[PDB]
Amino acid sequence: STFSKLREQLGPVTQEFWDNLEKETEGLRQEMSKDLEEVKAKVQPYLDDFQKKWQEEMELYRQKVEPLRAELQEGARQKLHELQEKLSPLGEEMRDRARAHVDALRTHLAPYSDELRQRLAARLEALKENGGARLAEYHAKATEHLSTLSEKAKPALEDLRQGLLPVLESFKVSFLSALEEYTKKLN
Amino acid sequence: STFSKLREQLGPVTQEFWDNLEKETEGLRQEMSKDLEEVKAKVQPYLDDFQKKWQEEMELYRQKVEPLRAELQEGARQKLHELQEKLSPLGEEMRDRARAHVDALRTHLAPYSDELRQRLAARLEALKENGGARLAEYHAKATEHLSTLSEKAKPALEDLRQGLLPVLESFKVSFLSALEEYTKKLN
Ligand SMILES: CCCCCCCC/C=C\CCCCCCCC(=O)OC[C@H](COP(=O)(O)OC[C@H](N)C(=O)O)OC(=O)CCCCCCC/C=C\CCCCCCCC
Ligand SMILES: CCCCCCCC/C=C\CCCCCCCC(=O)OC[C@H](COP(=O)(O)OC[C@H](N)C(=O)O)OC(=O)CCCCCCC/C=C\CCCCCCCC
Ligand SMILES: CCCCCCCC/C=C\CCCCCCCC(=O)OC[C@H](COP(=O)(O)OCC[N+](C)(C)C)OC(=O)CC
Ligand SMILES: CCCCCCCC/C=C\CCCCCCCC(=O)OC[C@H](COP(=O)(O)OCC[N+](C)(C)C)OC(=O)CC
Ligand SMILES: CCCCCCCC/C=C\CCCCCCCC(=O)OC[C@H](COP(=O)(O)OCC[N+](C)(C)C)OC(=O)CC
Ligand SMILES: CCCCCCCC/C=C\CCCCCCCC(=O)OC[C@H](COP(=O)(O)OCC[N+](C)(C)C)OC(=O)CC
Ligand SMILES: CCCCCCCC/C=C\CCCCCCCC(=O)OC[C@H](COP(=O)(O)OCC[N+](C)(C)C)OC(=O)CC
Ligand SMILES: CCCCCCCC/C=C\CCCCCCCC(=O)OC[C@H](COP(=O)(O)OCC[N+](C)(C)C)OC(=O)CC
Ligand SMILES: CCCCCCCC/C=C\CCCCCCCC(=O)OC[C@H](COP(=O)(O)OCC[N+](C)(C)C)OC(=O)CC
Ligand SMILES: CCCCCCCC/C=C\CCCCCCCC(=O)OC[C@H](COP(=O)(O)OCC[N+](C)(C)C)OC(=O)CC
Ligand SMILES: CCCCCCCC/C=C\CCCCCCCC(=O)OC[C@H](COP(=O)(O)OCC[N+](C)(C)C)OC(=O)CC
Ligand SMILES: CCCCCCCC/C=C\CCCCCCCC(=O)OC[C@H](COP(=O)(O)OCC[N+](C)(C)C)OC(=O)CC
Ligand SMILES: CCCCCCCC/C=C\CCCCCCCC(=O)OC[C@H](COP(=O)(O)OCC[N+](C)(C)C)OC(=O)CC
Ligand SMILES: CCCCCCCC/C=C\CCCCCCCC(=O)OC[C@H](COP(=O)(O)OCC[N+](C)(C)C)OC(=O)CC
Ligand SMILES: CCCCCCCC/C=C\CCCCCCCC(=O)OC[C@H](COP(=O)(O)OCC[N+](C)(C)C)OC(=O)CC
């Protein structure tokens, strides 16, 4: 705690020194910023005037392109309205024919699909009956060759625990005194 | 280990029974699948025939409108050129005016970018001459603080280590000794 008290004492001394030193440079820097600020406002009017001139030219062009925009808009509009009228009848026709085809397709496969799913249903059911027999037998044997393990694993773990306790207990006691023996040095 | 051996002993026995049983079901499932697939091969043709019908229809329809779109596209190809010719002239008019604007814009900043460099250097030179003297004091006083920083840092650590080793070395002994005992029981 010696260094802590000394460091806090030496600091304030140079603290004021560096403060005044930085303050001096700060003051000088402000002068530089002040002159620079003035220059910024000096060229401002010149940049403003030039900008106004630019705007005038751009607005003039906006007015010139206004009528042309309307004309080109009409020319483009007149193109689609002519084409759409010649493409609609063809599309309208084929759409109905396609739609009707899908419906007929579904109706055609309906009876075929119905019989297939019906025949397969019985097939799967017959197979299930046989499988269930063998399945049941396997289930009963599965549990028989399962419970036997844990039944002898649990008691063995308890016995093991009882044999480690004595050694651990004595070790814990030494750990306590050892731990606190370190705290004294740290603190 | 005997517990797990008992599990492995009757393992393959049960597996062999179930595996052979499942193999028997395989042949049954195979026969069922073959008899099902045989019928599915009859349903397919009826779908293909229907699909192939509409396919040819669409093929002919598509061919019918083939040159029809060409007539429309041809007009679009020409109308395209028309709109371009009526818009280009105006763009060119402003294009020349744009380049003329750049000429003035460049010459308007050219001299400033030079004087800006002059003022910048003058400011830096003056600042350097001023701060150059304080930079030395900043370092001089900083080093003095550094000496009072890393002085009693190392010596204190050496003393701390000496008052720990004789206690830690003895702790490892008890730890390692107990380890061997636990291993014996666990193994
Ligand atoms: C250089 C880069 C540009 C400037 C960066 C710093 C800008 C200012 C900000 C912090 C400065 C450092 C501040 C360090 C802690 C200072 C703590 C202190 O002394 O407080 C008392 C006074 C006043 O402080 P405040 O201005 O914070 O006012 C506090 C008051 N309660 C309120 O908020 O109303 O102090 C003062 O008036 C002047 C103190 C001068 C200390 C020495 C001077 C400290 C100034 C700069 C260096 C600080 C670190 C020095 C060591 C490392 C570098 C060598
Ligand atoms: C049970 C399912 C989950 C655990 C599965 C563990 C599978 C084995 C994995 C590691 C054990 C071996 C770990 C390495 C042991 C040291 C190496 C050894 O001696 O291997 C002996 C032989 C031959 O070699 P490996 O099989 O080990 O393979 C090559 C070997 N590792 C090498 O280095 O080349 O393999 C064997 O004897 C089989 C040993 C295991 C028998 C089954 C051991 C099974 C586990 C426990 C049984 C004993 C305890 C029973 C009571 C408690 C039950 C929870
Ligand atoms: C580089 C290796 C250094 C090894 C030694 C330790 C570091 C020494 C270096 C600098 C030390 C600076 C002082 C550190 C604390 C010294 C003891 C001390 O003052 O205790 C007391 C100090 C009181 O601080 P405050 O007056 O701000 O109180 C704030 C409110 N609470 C927190 C007190 C409730 O505690 C602190 O300042 C920390 C919050
Ligand atoms: C020059 C070498 C020796 C060290 C010199 C000082 C180095 C810088 C010290 C601290 C960093 C901040 C410096 C600038 C602010 C100083 C004042 C300050 O608020 O410090 C931070 C704090 C202030 O505590 P106060 O109770 O005064 O509250 C002030 C208002 N605020 C900050 C709470 C909003 O105190 C500390 O954090 C402990 C150090
Ligand atoms: C060639 C590279 C360098 C180019 C430098 C160009 C010139 C730069 C000079 C100054 C920077 C711009 C200054 C004008 C915008 C300031 C924006 C800003 O954040 O103001 C922040 C703050 C605003 O303060 P107030 O809202 O109270 O009113 C303005 C300041 N006065 C008039 C009250 C003092 O400033 C101050 O308080 C005083 C410093
Ligand atoms: C590396 C450079 C990056 C920046 C490039 C573009 C620099 C600016 C472009 C050209 C420089 C000259 C610009 C001239 C017009 C400036 C317009 C401007 O900002 O007014 C800024 C400000 C605007 O408010 P006023 O109070 O003026 O008027 C009312 C508000 N309205 C209507 C103007 C939105 O007015 C001032 O601050 C007074 C000086
Ligand atoms: C790959 C695309 C190539 C396109 C090239 C440029 C094509 C230019 C064609 C048209 C330009 C846009 C015209 C937008 C208005 C169309 C108005 C119109 O269609 O009147 C004809 C009819 C009814 O139109 P309405 O005015 O009653 O309703 C739509 C328009 N309003 C009302 C919302 C403004 O609609 C049709 O016959 C289309 C099924
Ligand atoms: C070998 C390939 C196996 C994978 C592809 C199988 C393709 C279809 C052929 C055979 C599969 C088995 C068909 C027979 C058993 C069907 C079992 C089943 O869950 O029926 C499910 C369901 C049963 O009928 P519903 O849910 O309609 O009930 C009656 C109607 N209401 C009361 C619900 C309104 O029918 C369907 O969901 C049709 C999809
Ligand atoms: C390699 C030979 C051993 C193979 C064992 C695995 C294969 C077993 C063969 C067929 C059956 C597999 C599915 C059933 C396995 C479990 C059978 C059994 O009764 O376990 C025992 C028990 C059964 O419980 P429940 O079926 O009455 O259900 C109760 C509610 N919860 C838990 C289902 C939400 O469950 C447990 O004790 C917890 C694990
Ligand atoms: C390598 C270990 C593999 C462990 C799983 C395969 C071997 C064990 C399988 C089956 C064991 C069958 C014989 C079990 C004899 C001991 C039975 C026993 O003590 O039950 C003890 C206890 C009984 O609890 P409850 O009957 O009130 O059931 C409550 C609902 N739950 C928790 C069962 C979902 O349940 C447990 O302690 C474990 C959750
Ligand atoms: C690697 C060099 C040798 C390190 C040997 C370490 C021997 C002890 C092992 C772990 C403890 C490390 C403590 C590190 C911080 C020491 C200073 C410290 O924080 O004291 C205090 C710290 C926390 O516990 P405290 O009791 O102080 O605070 C909470 C309880 N009360 C106070 C609210 C009632 O103590 C520890 O965290 C454990 C000692
Ligand atoms: C939007 C769906 C309309 C459905 C009803 C109409 C279906 C028939 C209409 C078009 C089908 C494709 C016709 C293909 C033969 C005519 C192609 C043709 O125009 O050659 C004339 C001309 C040039 O054809 P190119 O083959 O040289 O194309 C340019 C080169 N690259 C890009 C092909 C490498 O066409 C054009 O310049 C573009 C309009
Ligand atoms: C309202 C009408 C405008 C909107 C609807 C347009 C419908 C037609 C759309 C695309 C196809 C027709 C595009 C316009 C007619 C093009 C006629 C033509 O020159 O074919 C051939 C032409 C060959 O082009 P090159 O690759 O040899 O390059 C020539 C030089 N430049 C242009 C690259 C500088 O193809 C093209 O230039 C690509 C467009
Ligand atoms: C509301 C308005 C909506 C849009 C309306 C658009 C109306 C016009 C339609 C499409 C716009 C693009 C038309 C492009 C036609 C291109 C015709 C063409 O290049 O012939 C070829 C001719 C020479 O091509 P070169 O490759 O030798 O030179 C130009 C390209 N390089 C060389 C500079 C890379 O083109 C020129 O000489 C241009 C100076
Ligand atoms: C944050 C404001 C308060 C603190 C301001 C501290 C200003 C710098 C401190 C002292 C002025 C610079 C002294 C440079 C020589 C002493 C060592 C040193 O500083 O190394 C840091 C730095 C570079 O030093 P050198 O380029 O000499 O490199 C090492 C020497 N050899 C290998 C190049 C031969 O210093 C500077 O860049 C000068 C600004």
Tab-separated table of C-alpha atoms in Angstrom, chain A residues 105 108-117, chain B residues 36-50:
chain	number	residue	atom	x	y	z
A	105	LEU	CA	-56.841	-36.068	-66.541
A	108	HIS	CA	-59.398	-40.427	-65.879
A	109	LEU	CA	-56.883	-41.460	-63.219
A	110	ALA	CA	-59.540	-41.351	-60.480
A	111	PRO	CA	-60.994	-44.926	-60.920
A	112	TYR	CA	-57.535	-46.385	-61.564
A	113	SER	CA	-56.064	-44.721	-58.478
A	114	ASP	CA	-59.090	-45.730	-56.405
A	115	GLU	CA	-58.682	-49.437	-57.185
A	116	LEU	CA	-54.915	-49.351	-56.716
A	117	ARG	CA	-55.140	-47.718	-53.267
B	36	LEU	CA	-48.569	-54.560	-57.183
B	37	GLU	CA	-45.987	-53.243	-59.641
B	38	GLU	CA	-47.450	-55.536	-62.323
B	39	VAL	CA	-50.724	-53.598	-62.195
B	40	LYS	CA	-49.093	-50.157	-62.006
B	41	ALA	CA	-47.428	-50.831	-65.369
B	42	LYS	CA	-50.903	-51.008	-66.931
B	43	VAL	CA	-52.130	-47.664	-65.591
B	44	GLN	CA	-49.158	-45.683	-66.949
B	45	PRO	CA	-49.947	-46.016	-70.737
B	46	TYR	CA	-53.380	-44.407	-70.237
B	47	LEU	CA	-51.734	-41.304	-68.773
B	48	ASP	CA	-48.985	-41.018	-71.376
B	49	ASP	CA	-51.483	-41.226	-74.239
B	50	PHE	CA	-53.510	-38.351	-72.790
